[PDB]
Amino acid sequence: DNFVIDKNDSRKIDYMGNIYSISDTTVSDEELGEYQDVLAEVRVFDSVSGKSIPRSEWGRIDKDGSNSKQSRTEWDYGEIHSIRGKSLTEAFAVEINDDFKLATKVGN
């Protein structure tokens, strides 16, 4: 219908009621197709599991909590583009941190 980031996961996309997650795959222009949709939001999560962090923690981490086993990731919602020889329903490309990354359907 329209690309929506999962309310529970800043690393997932809720599109057509289907669920697509982004690992880390650099998508070159030769594999990239054409422009699909434009984004304009940013989120922060702990990449270990994908736990979204609130905007109140985006600056004030913790002063004693020892985040030594918590690895935040700040992903900027970049525009979406298609992939040559692949449907959006299986896999597509998303501009993440100015780098187009491959997202693949997942069931969670």
Side-chain angles (χ1 to χ4, degrees):
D1 313 62
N2 44 211
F3 302 89
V4 170
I5 303 91
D6 188 354
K7 46 158 165 49
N8 299 137
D9 243 293
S10 310
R11 87 199 202 280
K12 296 192 208 153
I13 298 293
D14 272 44
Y15 173 65
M16 301 176 141
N18 302 321
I19 291 287
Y20 322 70
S21 178
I22 310 123
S23 184
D24 52 309
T25 302
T26 308
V27 183
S28 308
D29 180 80
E30 62 215 66
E31 302 203 51
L32 205 68
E34 73 196 292
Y35 166 76
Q36 194 79 248
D37 206 53
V38 64
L39 266 297
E41 245 186 312
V42 186
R43 279 295 178 71
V44 183
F45 60 90
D46 184 2
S47 209
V48 294
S49 271
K51 293 95 62 56
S52 35
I53 251 75
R55 197 170 165 203
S56 50
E57 291 273 295
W58 285 20
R60 290 92 168 156
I61 134 153
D62 201 310
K63 297 198 67 59
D64 180 70
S66 197
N67 299 85
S68 209
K69 295 300 205 72
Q70 319 189 4
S71 202
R72 289 194 321 274
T73 299
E74 189 157 307
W75 284 0
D76 181 356
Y77 308 166
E79 54 195 298
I80 296 161
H81 278 235
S82 62
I83 294 180
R84 284 171 72 181
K86 286 270 188 66
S87 285
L88 265 268
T89 42
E90 54 176 331
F92 70 92
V94 60
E95 186 169 85
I96 295 294
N97 279 255
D98 285 278
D99 245 325
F100 270 89
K101 301 309 185 196
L102 199 279
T104 18
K105 177 151 120 60
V106 69
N108 167 90

XYZ file of all heavy atoms in Angstrom:
859
model
N 0.845 -1.199 0.000
C 0.000 0.000 0.000
C 0.875 1.241 0.000
O 0.825 2.046 -0.926
C -1.057 0.005 1.119
C -1.805 -1.326 1.197
O -1.145 -2.357 1.469
O -3.028 -1.384 0.976
N 1.701 1.401 1.027
C 2.658 2.476 1.266
C 3.672 1.895 2.248
O 3.298 1.091 3.107
C 1.998 3.758 1.806
C 0.952 3.613 2.909
O 0.035 4.420 2.978
N 1.033 2.610 3.762
N 4.949 2.209 2.086
C 6.005 1.696 2.952
C 5.880 2.331 4.329
O 5.796 3.556 4.437
C 7.377 1.952 2.322
C 7.515 1.314 0.957
C 7.124 2.017 -0.196
C 7.972 -0.011 0.849
C 7.169 1.392 -1.454
C 8.032 -0.632 -0.408
C 7.622 0.066 -1.556
N 5.859 1.508 5.371
C 5.741 1.928 6.755
C 6.823 1.182 7.527
O 7.022 -0.007 7.295
C 4.324 1.547 7.244
C 4.153 1.717 8.759
C 3.250 2.402 6.551
N 7.562 1.846 8.413
C 8.574 1.162 9.205
C 7.799 0.497 10.357
O 6.857 1.102 10.888
C 9.658 2.151 9.670
C 10.331 2.899 8.493
C 10.743 1.361 10.412
C 9.671 4.228 8.110
N 8.145 -0.731 10.753
C 7.448 -1.447 11.835
C 7.450 -0.606 13.116
O 8.494 -0.097 13.534
C 8.040 -2.853 12.070
C 7.253 -3.732 13.057
O 6.285 -3.229 13.681
O 7.662 -4.910 13.243
N 6.282 -0.384 13.736
C 6.149 0.389 14.978
C 7.031 -0.183 16.074
O 7.436 0.556 16.974
C 4.693 0.413 15.483
C 3.991 -0.960 15.474
C 2.798 -1.046 16.429
C 1.883 -2.255 16.165
N 2.591 -3.549 16.027
N 7.316 -1.481 15.995
C 8.123 -2.214 16.952
C 9.540 -2.470 16.481
O 10.371 -2.935 17.268
C 7.426 -3.549 17.206
C 6.040 -3.341 17.799
O 5.063 -3.981 17.426
N 5.882 -2.398 18.709
N 9.835 -2.162 15.221
C 11.154 -2.388 14.668
C 11.563 -1.412 13.570
O 11.103 -1.463 12.436
C 11.233 -3.828 14.162
C 12.282 -4.567 14.953
O 13.475 -4.220 14.819
O 11.932 -5.497 15.713
N 12.475 -0.516 13.910
C 13.045 0.500 13.045
C 13.865 -0.119 11.897
O 14.219 0.581 10.956
C 13.977 1.344 13.903
O 13.376 1.800 15.114
N 14.194 -1.416 11.993
C 14.954 -2.186 11.005
C 14.042 -3.030 10.112
O 14.542 -3.829 9.313
C 16.008 -3.046 11.723
C 15.500 -4.425 12.189
C 16.439 -4.967 13.263
N 16.381 -6.434 13.416
C 15.510 -7.221 14.059
N 14.456 -6.721 14.673
N 15.716 -8.531 14.106
N 12.725 -2.959 10.320
C 11.761 -3.704 9.524
C 10.842 -2.751 8.781
O 10.623 -1.621 9.208
C 10.920 -4.598 10.419
C 11.713 -5.701 11.130
C 10.670 -6.651 11.726
C 11.176 -7.365 12.966
N 10.036 -7.722 13.832
N 10.234 -3.248 7.713
C 9.314 -2.531 6.860
C 8.056 -3.381 6.797
O 8.135 -4.596 6.591
C 9.952 -2.324 5.469
C 11.243 -1.481 5.531
C 8.962 -1.707 4.459
C 11.054 -0.011 5.928
N 6.922 -2.729 6.988
C 5.565 -3.225 6.964
C 5.046 -2.674 5.635
O 4.725 -1.486 5.530
C 4.714 -2.611 8.104
C 4.702 -3.300 9.470
O 5.737 -3.730 10.007
O 3.619 -3.304 10.100
N 5.021 -3.474 4.573
C 4.534 -3.035 3.268
C 3.646 -4.137 2.715
O 4.067 -5.290 2.639
C 5.680 -2.611 2.341
C 5.241 -2.319 0.922
C 4.376 -1.242 0.669
C 5.701 -3.105 -0.148
C 4.003 -0.919 -0.643
C 5.347 -2.782 -1.469
C 4.502 -1.682 -1.719
O 4.130 -1.373 -2.985
N 2.419 -3.782 2.321
C 1.415 -4.709 1.797
C 1.087 -5.770 2.853
O 0.786 -6.915 2.522
C 1.872 -5.305 0.452
C 2.109 -4.204 -0.574
S 2.746 -4.792 -2.157
C 1.769 -3.674 -3.182
N 1.191 -5.413 4.141
C 0.943 -6.320 5.258
C 2.052 -7.375 5.392
O 1.971 -8.260 6.245
N 3.054 -7.339 4.509
C 4.187 -8.245 4.494
C 5.267 -7.593 5.353
O 5.212 -6.382 5.595
C 4.688 -8.489 3.072
C 3.648 -9.050 2.121
O 2.832 -9.895 2.479
N 3.689 -8.630 0.870
N 6.279 -8.360 5.759
C 7.342 -7.852 6.630
C 8.706 -8.060 5.989
O 9.029 -9.184 5.622
C 7.169 -8.526 8.013
C 5.888 -8.023 8.716
C 8.349 -8.311 8.956
C 5.988 -6.586 9.238
N 9.502 -7.004 5.804
C 10.839 -7.070 5.185
C 11.860 -6.487 6.147
O 11.623 -5.420 6.705
C 10.924 -6.319 3.845
C 9.708 -6.399 2.941
C 8.528 -5.726 3.307
C 9.734 -7.145 1.747
C 7.367 -5.852 2.539
C 8.575 -7.237 0.952
C 7.380 -6.581 1.333
O 6.244 -6.677 0.586
N 12.959 -7.193 6.377
C 14.038 -6.789 7.283
C 15.281 -6.511 6.454
O 15.472 -7.105 5.388
C 14.268 -7.868 8.358
O 15.338 -7.557 9.234
N 16.135 -5.615 6.945
C 17.366 -5.214 6.281
C 18.546 -5.741 7.082
O 18.686 -5.405 8.260
C 17.456 -3.671 6.173
C 16.182 -3.018 5.593
C 18.671 -3.229 5.333
C 15.598 -1.991 6.557
N 19.358 -6.597 6.468
C 20.562 -7.119 7.105
C 21.632 -6.090 6.727
O 21.590 -4.958 7.215
C 20.850 -8.552 6.647
O 21.964 -9.109 7.334
N 22.557 -6.429 5.830
C 23.604 -5.606 5.340
C 24.048 -6.245 4.025
O 24.657 -7.315 3.991
C 24.748 -5.733 6.353
C 25.221 -7.154 6.733
O 24.395 -8.030 7.099
O 26.444 -7.409 6.615
N 23.565 -5.693 2.923
C 23.899 -6.067 1.566
C 24.055 -4.776 0.770
O 23.034 -4.095 0.643
C 22.838 -6.999 1.008
O 22.684 -8.175 1.779
C 23.090 -7.366 -0.455
N 25.210 -4.395 0.258
C 25.341 -3.182 -0.540
C 24.743 -3.497 -1.924
O 25.135 -4.488 -2.542
C 26.831 -2.830 -0.640
O 27.401 -2.796 0.658
C 27.115 -1.485 -1.310
N 23.784 -2.707 -2.407
C 23.135 -2.879 -3.709
C 23.780 -1.900 -4.697
O 23.644 -0.688 -4.537
C 21.608 -2.651 -3.594
C 20.899 -2.900 -4.937
C 20.972 -3.578 -2.543
N 24.518 -2.406 -5.686
C 25.174 -1.593 -6.706
C 24.133 -1.101 -7.724
O 23.071 -1.711 -7.864
C 26.237 -2.445 -7.413
O 27.124 -3.071 -6.502
N 24.455 -0.055 -8.494
C 23.569 0.533 -9.509
C 23.181 -0.474 -10.581
O 22.100 -0.382 -11.153
C 24.263 1.693 -10.235
C 23.352 2.325 -11.298
O 22.481 3.147 -10.925
O 23.515 2.011 -12.500
N 24.059 -1.433 -10.870
C 23.791 -2.437 -11.886
C 22.678 -3.384 -11.437
O 22.029 -4.009 -12.275
C 25.079 -3.198 -12.219
C 25.649 -3.960 -11.012
C 27.172 -3.970 -11.022
O 27.787 -2.887 -10.866
O 27.755 -5.075 -11.112
N 22.474 -3.514 -10.125
C 21.441 -4.370 -9.556
C 20.196 -3.529 -9.241
O 19.080 -4.048 -9.218
C 21.964 -5.076 -8.292
C 23.224 -5.938 -8.528
C 23.387 -7.028 -7.451
O 22.417 -7.780 -7.205
O 24.429 -7.129 -6.763
N 20.381 -2.235 -8.981
C 19.324 -1.282 -8.669
C 18.456 -1.062 -9.915
O 18.950 -1.130 -11.041
C 19.997 0.025 -8.207
C 19.138 0.920 -7.299
C 18.912 0.251 -5.938
C 19.857 2.252 -7.063
N 17.167 -0.786 -9.742
C 16.219 -0.550 -10.821
C 15.928 0.935 -10.981
O 16.731 1.659 -11.577
N 14.781 1.386 -10.481
C 14.296 2.761 -10.533
C 13.735 3.204 -9.175
O 13.573 2.377 -8.275
C 13.253 2.866 -11.659
C 11.909 2.198 -11.315
C 11.041 1.955 -12.549
O 10.557 2.947 -13.148
O 10.800 0.768 -12.898
N 13.427 4.498 -9.042
C 12.868 5.093 -7.831
C 11.483 4.508 -7.547
O 10.646 4.403 -8.451
C 12.777 6.617 -7.994
C 11.906 7.291 -6.948
C 12.383 7.479 -5.638
C 10.586 7.663 -7.270
C 11.537 8.020 -4.653
C 9.740 8.215 -6.296
C 10.208 8.387 -4.976
O 9.391 8.912 -4.026
N 11.222 4.191 -6.279
C 9.966 3.621 -5.824
C 9.222 4.518 -4.841
O 8.024 4.732 -5.037
C 10.257 2.278 -5.143
C 8.985 1.447 -4.929
C 8.568 0.766 -6.221
O 7.549 1.083 -6.831
N 9.354 -0.190 -6.674
N 9.865 4.973 -3.762
C 9.196 5.808 -2.762
C 10.192 6.634 -1.961
O 11.340 6.216 -1.840
C 8.428 4.893 -1.795
C 7.254 5.614 -1.151
O 6.440 6.190 -1.906
O 7.118 5.572 0.086
N 9.772 7.734 -1.337
C 10.655 8.606 -0.570
C 10.300 8.582 0.911
O 9.127 8.566 1.299
C 10.654 10.019 -1.191
C 9.291 10.715 -1.134
C 11.707 10.926 -0.554
N 11.340 8.538 1.736
C 11.290 8.523 3.190
C 11.839 9.823 3.772
O 12.368 10.643 3.023
C 12.000 7.304 3.754
C 11.107 6.094 4.031
C 10.044 6.384 5.099
C 10.467 5.503 2.770
N 11.573 10.065 5.060
C 12.003 11.266 5.775
C 11.790 11.117 7.287
O 10.901 11.746 7.868
C 11.225 12.487 5.259
N 12.507 10.207 7.935
C 12.445 9.967 9.379
C 13.766 9.284 9.751
O 14.497 8.837 8.877
C 11.218 9.111 9.780
C 10.185 9.844 10.654
C 9.054 8.933 11.172
O 8.450 8.168 10.375
O 8.743 8.960 12.389
N 14.076 9.178 11.038
C 15.312 8.559 11.531
C 14.971 7.832 12.825
O 14.066 8.266 13.548
C 16.391 9.648 11.786
C 17.758 9.043 12.152
C 16.611 10.597 10.598
N 15.636 6.726 13.153
C 15.387 6.001 14.402
C 16.706 5.495 14.935
O 17.716 5.507 14.231
C 14.417 4.822 14.242
C 12.925 5.164 14.231
C 12.343 5.749 15.521
N 10.920 6.085 15.377
C 9.885 5.243 15.275
N 10.044 3.922 15.370
N 8.682 5.754 15.064
N 16.697 5.060 16.188
C 17.851 4.505 16.866
C 17.404 3.201 17.543
O 16.383 3.201 18.234
C 18.422 5.535 17.855
C 19.680 4.989 18.530
C 18.787 6.869 17.183
N 18.121 2.087 17.351
C 17.807 0.790 17.978
C 19.083 0.053 18.393
O 20.165 0.503 18.030
C 16.949 -0.084 17.049
C 17.572 -0.417 15.712
C 18.365 -1.565 15.528
C 17.340 0.440 14.631
C 18.933 -1.829 14.266
C 17.899 0.182 13.372
C 18.704 -0.954 13.188
N 18.993 -1.036 19.179
C 20.149 -1.815 19.617
C 20.124 -3.021 18.699
O 19.256 -3.891 18.796
C 20.066 -2.171 21.096
C 21.309 -2.911 21.593
O 22.258 -3.129 20.813
O 21.314 -3.291 22.786
N 21.005 -2.963 17.714
C 21.222 -3.894 16.608
C 21.376 -5.354 16.989
O 21.201 -6.227 16.142
C 22.420 -3.416 15.788
O 22.298 -3.810 14.439
N 21.691 -5.641 18.244
C 21.856 -6.997 18.739
C 20.579 -7.789 18.456
O 20.629 -8.914 17.970
C 22.234 -6.948 20.236
C 23.621 -6.311 20.422
C 21.204 -6.166 21.073
N 19.432 -7.193 18.774
C 18.112 -7.745 18.608
C 17.169 -6.879 17.771
O 16.196 -7.393 17.231
C 17.597 -7.914 20.019
O 17.969 -9.183 20.518
N 17.423 -5.575 17.680
C 16.631 -4.593 16.957
C 15.768 -3.724 17.882
O 14.954 -2.947 17.397
N 15.922 -3.813 19.209
C 15.114 -3.036 20.155
C 15.201 -1.537 19.916
O 16.268 -0.956 20.110
C 15.474 -3.304 21.623
C 15.136 -4.721 22.089
C 16.315 -5.683 22.004
C 17.546 -5.353 22.854
N 17.232 -5.198 24.285
N 14.100 -0.922 19.501
C 14.006 0.503 19.263
C 14.239 1.235 20.587
O 13.778 0.799 21.651
C 12.642 0.854 18.641
O 11.578 0.042 19.119
N 14.962 2.346 20.510
C 15.300 3.220 21.621
C 14.401 4.462 21.477
O 14.087 4.861 20.349
C 16.831 3.508 21.595
C 17.572 2.805 22.744
C 17.183 4.987 21.640
C 17.693 1.318 22.444
N 13.979 5.102 22.575
C 13.135 6.285 22.539
C 13.984 7.527 22.278
O 15.187 7.540 22.539
C 12.500 6.322 23.925
C 13.614 5.796 24.815
C 14.286 4.738 23.944
N 13.362 8.611 21.809
C 14.091 9.844 21.520
C 14.691 10.455 22.785
O 15.579 11.303 22.697
C 13.173 10.813 20.774
C 13.960 11.924 20.069
C 13.093 12.759 19.126
N 13.801 13.998 18.776
C 13.252 15.138 18.346
N 11.988 15.205 17.944
N 13.982 16.241 18.337
N 14.221 10.064 23.969
C 14.752 10.582 25.212
C 16.128 9.985 25.534
O 16.829 10.538 26.375
C 13.746 10.331 26.345
O 13.285 8.985 26.391
N 16.580 8.942 24.827
C 17.840 8.257 25.053
C 18.844 8.496 23.917
O 19.990 8.062 23.984
C 17.488 6.771 25.135
C 16.694 6.325 26.373
C 17.539 5.970 27.591
O 18.293 4.977 27.509
O 17.285 6.558 28.670
N 18.434 9.204 22.862
C 19.248 9.525 21.688
C 20.431 10.457 21.973
O 21.241 10.724 21.082
C 18.344 10.190 20.659
C 17.406 9.324 19.902
C 16.968 8.090 20.237
C 16.799 9.644 18.624
N 16.038 7.679 19.301
C 15.903 8.596 18.281
C 16.926 10.720 17.723
C 15.142 8.634 17.108
C 16.193 10.749 16.524
C 15.303 9.709 16.222
N 20.512 10.998 23.180
C 21.575 11.885 23.623
C 22.017 11.441 25.007
O 23.209 11.255 25.266
N 21.073 11.325 25.941
C 21.371 10.871 27.291
C 21.308 9.353 27.228
O 20.211 8.813 27.337
C 20.356 11.389 28.317
C 20.423 12.884 28.607
C 19.494 13.699 27.708
N 19.406 15.055 28.242
C 19.099 16.195 27.629
N 18.840 16.245 26.327
N 19.066 17.290 28.369
N 22.435 8.677 27.030
C 22.563 7.256 26.941
C 22.138 6.705 28.310
O 20.980 6.396 28.576
C 23.978 6.916 26.398
C 24.794 5.816 27.078
C 24.841 8.116 26.008
C 25.807 5.099 26.177
N 23.092 6.730 29.226
C 23.010 6.304 30.619
C 24.306 6.757 31.290
O 25.355 6.771 30.629
C 22.860 4.778 30.723
C 22.261 4.371 32.063
O 22.767 4.835 33.109
O 21.302 3.563 32.059
N 24.274 7.162 32.562
C 25.460 7.616 33.285
C 26.096 6.537 34.154
O 27.203 6.777 34.628
C 25.185 8.920 34.048
C 24.834 10.056 33.067
C 24.980 11.459 33.676
C 26.430 11.864 34.003
N 27.319 11.844 32.820
N 25.466 5.376 34.337
C 26.046 4.279 35.126
C 25.671 2.907 34.560
O 26.418 1.948 34.743
C 25.668 4.346 36.612
C 26.309 3.162 37.349
O 27.555 3.165 37.500
O 25.587 2.184 37.637
N 24.594 2.826 33.773
C 24.064 1.612 33.158
C 25.073 0.727 32.425
O 24.754 -0.437 32.177
N 26.254 1.243 32.076
C 27.336 0.556 31.393
C 26.806 -0.174 30.161
O 26.668 -1.398 30.133
C 28.069 -0.322 32.414
O 29.341 -0.721 31.954
N 26.528 0.587 29.105
C 26.006 0.124 27.816
C 27.012 -0.741 27.034
O 26.874 -0.904 25.826
C 25.531 1.327 26.982
C 24.416 2.086 27.688
O 24.699 2.938 28.523
N 23.162 1.768 27.439
N 28.003 -1.330 27.702
C 29.078 -2.182 27.212
C 28.627 -3.412 26.405
O 29.465 -4.073 25.796
C 29.892 -2.605 28.443
O 31.250 -2.840 28.136
N 27.334 -3.747 26.414
C 26.733 -4.873 25.694
C 25.487 -4.387 24.944
O 24.532 -5.146 24.755
C 26.413 -6.011 26.686
C 27.632 -6.654 27.365
C 28.612 -7.283 26.358
C 29.447 -8.406 26.974
N 28.639 -9.617 27.217
N 25.442 -3.105 24.584
C 24.341 -2.459 23.886
C 25.000 -1.652 22.774
O 25.841 -0.793 23.049
C 23.512 -1.608 24.870
C 23.289 -2.300 26.235
C 22.297 -1.594 27.149
O 21.681 -0.598 26.782
N 22.134 -2.093 28.359
N 24.682 -1.954 21.519
C 25.258 -1.310 20.356
C 24.178 -0.580 19.565
O 23.464 -1.189 18.759
C 25.973 -2.404 19.556
O 26.959 -1.841 18.722
N 24.023 0.727 19.814
C 23.017 1.491 19.097
C 23.426 1.596 17.636
O 24.612 1.559 17.292
C 22.799 2.906 19.667
C 22.086 2.920 21.027
C 21.549 4.306 21.442
N 22.439 5.438 21.111
C 23.453 5.905 21.847
N 23.845 5.301 22.965
N 24.063 7.019 21.464
N 22.425 1.777 16.798
C 22.527 1.934 15.369
C 21.515 3.010 15.045
O 20.371 2.953 15.503
C 22.251 0.605 14.663
O 23.220 -0.327 15.073
C 22.325 0.736 13.147
N 21.952 4.003 14.288
C 21.192 5.149 13.860
C 21.030 5.054 12.351
O 21.982 5.230 11.586
C 21.921 6.401 14.344
C 21.104 7.683 14.136
C 21.573 8.779 15.112
O 21.624 8.525 16.344
O 21.920 9.903 14.671
N 19.823 4.693 11.931
C 19.459 4.555 10.536
C 18.498 5.659 10.147
O 17.487 5.889 10.819
C 18.865 3.173 10.232
C 19.817 2.018 10.131
C 21.161 2.059 10.283
C 19.502 0.626 9.824
N 21.697 0.811 10.069
C 20.715 -0.125 9.830
C 18.313 -0.079 9.542
C 20.742 -1.508 9.604
C 18.332 -1.465 9.297
C 19.541 -2.180 9.336
N 18.872 6.335 9.065
C 18.159 7.432 8.447
C 17.339 6.854 7.300
O 17.871 6.081 6.497
C 19.219 8.416 7.953
C 18.656 9.664 7.288
O 17.429 9.780 7.120
O 19.487 10.545 6.967
N 16.036 7.134 7.279
C 15.118 6.658 6.263
C 15.282 7.429 4.957
O 14.717 8.499 4.738
C 13.693 6.639 6.804
C 13.481 5.914 8.117
C 12.268 6.127 8.786
C 14.438 5.028 8.662
C 12.022 5.496 10.009
C 14.197 4.386 9.880
C 12.974 4.604 10.540
O 12.680 3.900 11.654
N 15.988 6.767 4.050
C 16.348 7.117 2.710
C 15.331 6.496 1.764
O 14.600 5.559 2.121
N 15.248 7.045 0.558
C 14.271 6.612 -0.420
C 14.569 5.195 -0.904
O 15.667 4.648 -0.805
C 14.327 7.589 -1.610
C 15.718 7.783 -2.234
C 15.752 9.009 -3.141
O 15.009 9.057 -4.146
O 16.560 9.933 -2.887
N 13.479 4.552 -1.304
C 13.403 3.185 -1.764
C 13.443 3.148 -3.278
O 12.857 3.981 -3.970
C 12.125 2.541 -1.185
C 12.218 2.490 0.351
C 11.968 1.108 -1.690
C 10.862 2.298 1.039
N 14.143 2.136 -3.774
C 14.343 1.857 -5.191
C 14.143 0.362 -5.444
O 14.288 -0.476 -4.542
C 15.741 2.314 -5.652
C 15.865 3.789 -5.968
N 16.317 4.318 -7.159
C 15.569 4.848 -5.147
C 16.243 5.656 -7.070
N 15.809 6.023 -5.856
N 13.717 0.014 -6.652
C 13.473 -1.364 -7.073
C 14.793 -2.079 -7.387
O 15.867 -1.471 -7.363
C 12.531 -1.368 -8.285
O 13.138 -0.701 -9.371
N 14.737 -3.388 -7.651
C 15.891 -4.208 -8.001
C 15.556 -4.914 -9.311
O 14.432 -5.378 -9.546
C 16.283 -5.160 -6.851
C 16.779 -4.291 -5.677
C 17.359 -6.188 -7.265
C 17.213 -5.107 -4.469
N 16.542 -4.948 -10.199
C 16.473 -5.563 -11.513
C 16.353 -7.073 -11.344
O 17.178 -7.676 -10.660
C 17.708 -5.122 -12.309
C 17.496 -3.671 -12.765
C 18.749 -3.057 -13.376
N 19.067 -3.601 -14.703
C 20.129 -3.213 -15.416
N 20.967 -2.312 -14.913
N 20.343 -3.710 -16.627
N 15.318 -7.688 -11.918
C 15.101 -9.129 -11.837
C 14.496 -9.610 -10.517
O 14.516 -10.821 -10.279
N 13.985 -8.718 -9.654
C 13.402 -9.073 -8.359
C 12.176 -8.223 -8.053
O 12.165 -7.020 -8.339
C 14.449 -8.795 -7.268
C 15.596 -9.814 -7.222
C 15.269 -10.980 -6.282
C 16.482 -11.889 -6.070
N 17.592 -11.226 -5.360
N 11.162 -8.817 -7.433
C 9.944 -8.127 -7.050
C 10.111 -7.561 -5.645
O 10.820 -8.110 -4.804
C 8.758 -9.084 -7.061
O 8.363 -9.373 -8.384
N 9.416 -6.464 -5.363
C 9.443 -5.790 -4.070
C 9.007 -6.730 -2.949
O 9.485 -6.611 -1.825
C 8.450 -4.614 -4.151
C 9.060 -3.249 -4.518
C 9.423 -2.506 -3.234
C 10.265 -3.348 -5.473
N 8.110 -7.659 -3.269
C 7.488 -8.671 -2.428
C 8.435 -9.770 -1.948
O 8.079 -10.573 -1.082
C 6.309 -9.255 -3.225
O 6.690 -9.464 -4.577
C 5.174 -8.230 -3.240
N 9.645 -9.820 -2.491
C 10.668 -10.783 -2.144
C 11.881 -10.012 -1.639
O 12.427 -10.383 -0.590
C 10.973 -11.751 -3.310
C 11.324 -11.068 -4.642
C 11.725 -12.020 -5.763
O 12.274 -13.107 -5.480
O 11.549 -11.655 -6.954
N 12.304 -8.954 -2.345
C 13.454 -8.162 -1.944
C 13.511 -6.865 -2.735
O 13.145 -6.809 -3.909
C 14.746 -8.946 -2.181
N 14.022 -5.816 -2.099
C 14.135 -4.499 -2.702
C 15.290 -3.731 -2.071
O 15.937 -4.240 -1.150
C 12.802 -3.776 -2.558
C 12.451 -3.367 -1.148
C 12.826 -2.091 -0.716
C 11.753 -4.229 -0.279
C 12.488 -1.648 0.564
C 11.401 -3.780 1.009
C 11.751 -2.484 1.419
N 15.570 -2.530 -2.576
C 16.664 -1.674 -2.099
C 16.179 -0.428 -1.344
O 15.260 0.244 -1.803
C 17.511 -1.244 -3.298
N 16.834 -0.086 -0.230
C 16.524 1.068 0.608
C 17.774 1.882 0.891
O 18.785 1.312 1.289
C 15.858 0.619 1.929
C 16.672 -0.326 2.849
C 15.481 1.860 2.733
N 17.722 3.191 0.687
C 18.849 4.065 0.976
C 18.965 4.149 2.509
O 18.093 4.702 3.174
C 18.650 5.439 0.316
C 19.880 6.338 0.483
C 19.848 7.605 -0.384
O 19.258 8.633 0.025
O 20.539 7.636 -1.425
N 19.980 3.516 3.097
C 20.234 3.527 4.540
C 21.617 4.116 4.746
O 22.606 3.526 4.320
C 20.086 2.125 5.167
C 18.636 1.628 5.056
C 20.550 2.085 6.637
C 17.602 2.412 5.872
N 21.700 5.219 5.494
C 22.959 5.914 5.767
C 23.681 6.223 4.448
O 24.880 5.963 4.305
C 23.875 5.150 6.747
C 23.523 5.315 8.211
O 24.188 6.033 8.948
N 22.550 4.585 8.722
N 22.926 6.730 3.473
C 23.399 7.107 2.137
C 23.910 5.907 1.332
O 24.540 6.078 0.287
C 24.399 8.280 2.197
C 23.680 9.596 2.458
O 23.156 10.184 1.489
O 23.604 10.021 3.632
N 23.632 4.678 1.779
C 24.050 3.463 1.077
C 22.815 2.595 0.819
O 22.129 2.191 1.755
C 25.110 2.707 1.907
C 26.495 2.611 1.270
O 26.613 2.499 0.027
O 27.488 2.545 2.040
N 22.513 2.257 -0.438
C 21.355 1.422 -0.764
C 21.579 -0.012 -0.280
O 22.471 -0.700 -0.786
C 21.012 1.461 -2.254
C 20.030 2.554 -2.599
C 20.468 3.845 -2.940
C 18.653 2.281 -2.509
C 19.528 4.850 -3.217
C 17.716 3.288 -2.766
C 18.153 4.571 -3.131
N 20.759 -0.476 0.669
C 20.820 -1.805 1.265
C 19.641 -2.688 0.880
O 18.497 -2.244 0.735
C 20.960 -1.721 2.797
C 22.203 -0.967 3.298
C 23.509 -1.447 2.659
C 24.717 -0.744 3.276
N 25.910 -0.904 2.424
N 19.927 -3.980 0.751
C 18.968 -5.016 0.385
C 18.135 -5.455 1.581
O 18.688 -5.813 2.623
C 19.755 -6.244 -0.110
C 19.078 -7.320 -0.954
C 18.263 -8.322 -0.140
C 18.248 -6.687 -2.051
N 16.813 -5.466 1.439
C 15.898 -5.920 2.477
C 15.208 -7.157 1.926
O 14.856 -7.181 0.743
C 14.885 -4.854 2.857
N 14.975 -8.157 2.768
C 14.345 -9.411 2.373
C 13.187 -9.744 3.305
O 13.271 -9.516 4.519
C 15.391 -10.554 2.374
O 16.560 -10.244 3.119
C 15.827 -10.910 0.957
N 12.113 -10.320 2.747
C 10.942 -10.711 3.528
C 11.312 -11.644 4.682
O 12.185 -12.502 4.521
C 9.876 -11.391 2.641
C 8.674 -11.868 3.479
C 7.354 -11.882 2.698
C 6.719 -13.257 2.631
N 6.404 -13.807 3.965
N 10.716 -11.438 5.852
C 10.859 -12.239 7.057
C 9.438 -12.420 7.610
O 8.527 -11.675 7.243
C 11.936 -11.687 8.015
C 11.534 -10.364 8.647
C 12.330 -12.691 9.108
N 9.216 -13.405 8.477
C 7.905 -13.674 9.065
C 7.716 -13.096 10.465
O 6.754 -13.452 11.143
N 8.628 -12.258 10.949
C 8.570 -11.649 12.273
C 9.008 -10.210 12.162
O 8.182 -9.318 12.441
C 9.461 -12.415 13.253
C 9.658 -11.609 14.523
O 8.885 -11.727 15.472
N 10.684 -10.783 14.549
